[PDB]
Design a binder for this molecule. Structure first.
Ligand code: FKA
Lengths: 107, 107
């Protein structure tokens, strides 16, 4: 499933609803610790519509429990992520992913 | 594909290579003129590495044709951008994108 561990608390009142645009900064790491991606490195937040954007299950469930301003670590089992195939050229088969996510704003 | 039209020239000899980080300022518009994003509004340059599979095809092939210091208009057909899916709620399905880009430096 996904495990959420808070690094910094958010406001505790404003949680993402379906149809809202979540603006996040994330760093993705494999369970071993190799960073494979980061929006923070591109200097550009990832914006997606919760419910409309096709994302791995762990991300959808994990961000849904975060309130605005929270920074959390989501550890996602491969069945909640890219499973058995992985994502060619970026995620290996059967990988557990660790995401450091900050929910910056809901539009 | 990507059409690159010069607004102001670069040095004419330092072109991005695979494995280098392009640092750019840009504004992105849908072809009807609607602005959907800009690094200037975040006041941080956008950075991405060539070959790292982290930007749409139109960025990699467009910037590969620019020299440092160049400012250019890039027109990107949907098949070199978000295609038939778009980026729900930001980029519509089958959108041609127009970017005003300045390649500031390579690192
Ligand atoms: C640098 O790009 C990142 C993603 C966005 C920040 C950028 C973006 C909008 C990319 C589009 C592709 C833009 O490219 C185009 O639209 N190209 C258009 C085109 C294609 C072909 C022909 C013509 C035109 C995309 O893939 C959207 C997708 O929703 C992302 C956010 C999502 C993924 C990869 C979901 C997959 C989707 C497929 C499912 O099967 C799978 O199930 C396991 C889940 O990604 C995710 O679900 C998770 C959670 C959010 C962050 C992204 N993410 C990651 O796992 C990553 O960290 C990752 O590294 O993030 C990049 C992804 O690149 C595809 C790959 C992916 C491993």
């Amino acid at each position: 499933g996904v495990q959420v561990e808070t690094i910094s608390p958010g406001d505790g009142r404003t949680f993402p609803k379906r149809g809202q645009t979540c603006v996040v900064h994330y760093t993705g790491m494999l369970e071993d610790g190799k960073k494979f991606d980061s929006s923070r490195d591109r200097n550009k937040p990832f914006k997606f519509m919760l419910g409309k954007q096709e994302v791995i299950r762990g991300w959808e469930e994990g961000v849904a429990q975060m309130s605005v301003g929270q920074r959390a670590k989501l550890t996602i089992s491969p069945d909640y992520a890219y499973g058995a195939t992985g994502h060619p050229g970026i995620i290996p088969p059967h990988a557990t992913l660790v995401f450091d996510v900050e929910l910056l704003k809901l539009e």
